[PDB]
């Protein structure tokens, strides 16, 4: 198999509601969609979701980078994922969004060539995944109301955003808690909003509220501070922005900074790297959750889903980007219907088409 050509296009999908987190807001899912054509005719799909306030990447920069990658890999075999990353890495010292887009399309081609759904090439542990659904920052009573709604849809886990201040945040959780019950799992994400000691205070405050875990409580660069938190509460602390790639993961397991790690294809540059992170985490006894950027769509979510189902140590999933999309940019793959169960089929690759 040989890559004949690489095409990339912009994608802009209106979100059904304006999403808001501690780092900023977003109202449109704008990403880079790639299509890699082989000499034999097979076409693999990939996506690059740039998150300016998470990674600093932009759609303009992502599109430019993807084009440089596309011209550099013509003639290579998609199965040579090792060289493909070698090639991209020599071109750019940092562009996870661009790299993930190429990476994902290559794995899609691999699956299509082997005539196997992608999850089978990635470990084959399962052929489906269960995802939570996130609740963007808002008013305590508003979030509590939306919670009941998602639960009504069939969701058992809810990701709750916080970060305006330990005060209002605490009020937010409790409100939602005594609104849906105690059978529902509740994970919290503060996107680096708290200081070490105020983090310990806020978490302990929700001691009797039964929180599953707290995602990135402090600044991504304050590793000593993050470990401080992890080591003060018995509650499960997860690292997100503090862990982009495998080298980040190695540093965290070494220092024993957190309990769980959030993996995002758009942070590590693709499945190839995601595989590395999960392996390092599993070996260290740290489970992983597979996340997503608000800007990515069907292709990125589908790729992430196949990886999550395939790998045993990826025990949690936060693949809800397609739930807020007004329309689908492609056919097949993970539906936009808000449902916790994402079942992957027997279609080869990502199972996606124009
Ligand atoms: Mg997070």
UniProtKB/Swiss-Prot annotation:
The keyword Isomerase applies. CDD domains: L-Ala-DL-Glu_epimerase. Its EC number is 5.1.1.-. The keyword Nucleotide-binding does not apply. Substrate binds at residues 134, 159-161, 191, 264, 292-295, 318-320. InterPro entries: Dipeptide_epimerase, Enolase-like_C_sf, Enolase-like_N, Enolase_C-like, Mandel_Rmase/mucon_lact_enz_CS, Mandelate_racemase_C, Mandelate_racemase_N_dom. Binds 1 Mg(2+) ion per subunit. Its cofactor is Mg(2+). GO terms for molecular function: magnesium ion binding; racemase and epimerase activity; racemase and epimerase activity, acting on amino acids and derivatives. GO terms for biological process: amino acid catabolic process; peptide metabolic process. Keywords: Isomerase, Magnesium, Metal-binding. It is an enzyme of class 5 (isomerase). Mg(2+) binds at residues 189, 215, 240. Part of a large, functionally divergent protein family. Protein modeling and substrate docking was used to predict the substrate specificity, prior to biochemical analysis. Catalyzes the epimerization of L-Ile-L-Tyr to L-Ile-D-Tyr (in vitro). Catalyzes the epimerization of dipeptides, with a preference for substrates with a hydrophobic or basic amino acid in the first position, followed by an aromatic residue in the second position. Has epimerase activity with L-Ile-L-Tyr, L-Val-L-Tyr and L-Arg-L-Tyr (in vitro). Belongs to the mandelate racemase/muconate lactonizing enzyme family. This is Hydrophobic dipeptide epimerase. The lineage of its organism: Bacteria, Bacillati, Bacillota, Bacilli, Lactobacillales.
